Amino acid sequence: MKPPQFTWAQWFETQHINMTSQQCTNAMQVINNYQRRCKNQNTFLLTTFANVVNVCGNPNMTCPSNKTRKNCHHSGSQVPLIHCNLTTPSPQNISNCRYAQTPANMFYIVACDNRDQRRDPPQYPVVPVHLDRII
Numbered sequence: 455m456k457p458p459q460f461t462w463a464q465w466f467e468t469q470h471i472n473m474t475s476q477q478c479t480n481a482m483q484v485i486n487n488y489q490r491r492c493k494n495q496n497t498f499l500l501t502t503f504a505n506v507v508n509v510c511g512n513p514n515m516t517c518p519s520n521k522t523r524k525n526c527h528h529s530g531s532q533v534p535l536i537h538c539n540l541t542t543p544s545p546q547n548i549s550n551c552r553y554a555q556t557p558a559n560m561f562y563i564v565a566c567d568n569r570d571q572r573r574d575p576p577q578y579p580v581v582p583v584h585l586d587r588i589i
């Protein structure tokens with residue numbers, strides 16, 4: 455789920471593009487502090503927001519996760535990425551959650567939609583809103 459101050463595009467960026475630290479335990483604190491819980495796993499794509507926006511321009515395809523959605527797009531090429539896996543749940547005090555990190559170079563599929571009319575900058579009429587899968 456996402457905090458109210460974020461549009462889907464900004465939340466996508468916060469969760470999958472802006473890895474604030476190369477260490478998952480530190481990077482995941484941002485996501486967990488916003489979601490008020492420790493996300494079991496999360497993928498950080500080591501690419502630019504602009505690159506993802508352009509991927510939104512690639513041919514539409516069915517989303518591997520939801521066979522009813524047709525707003526997904528394949529990256530075309532592989533990109534470096536870090537996958538974070540929760541290793542220490544820490545019931546109370548989510549800042550104590552620890553994660554393992556898995557580096558890899560894979561293709562990705564993202565779902566994109568028109569920008570939030572009121573909050574997203576007009577610069578990008580089309581933006582990624584969900585990471586559907588990595589291959």
Ligand SMILES: Nc1ncnc2c1ncn2[C@@H]1O[C@H](COP(=O)(O)OP(=O)(O)O)[C@@H](O)[C@H]1O
Pocket residue numbers: 455469495496497517520523525565566567583584585
């Ligand atoms: N095809 C889709 N198009 C637009 N929005 C979607 C789509 N699929 C899922 N969503 C929404 O986007 C949210 C973002 O999920 P996300 O953070 O990307 O999941 P995770 O990173 O745990 O895989 C979902 O919880 C859902 O409400």
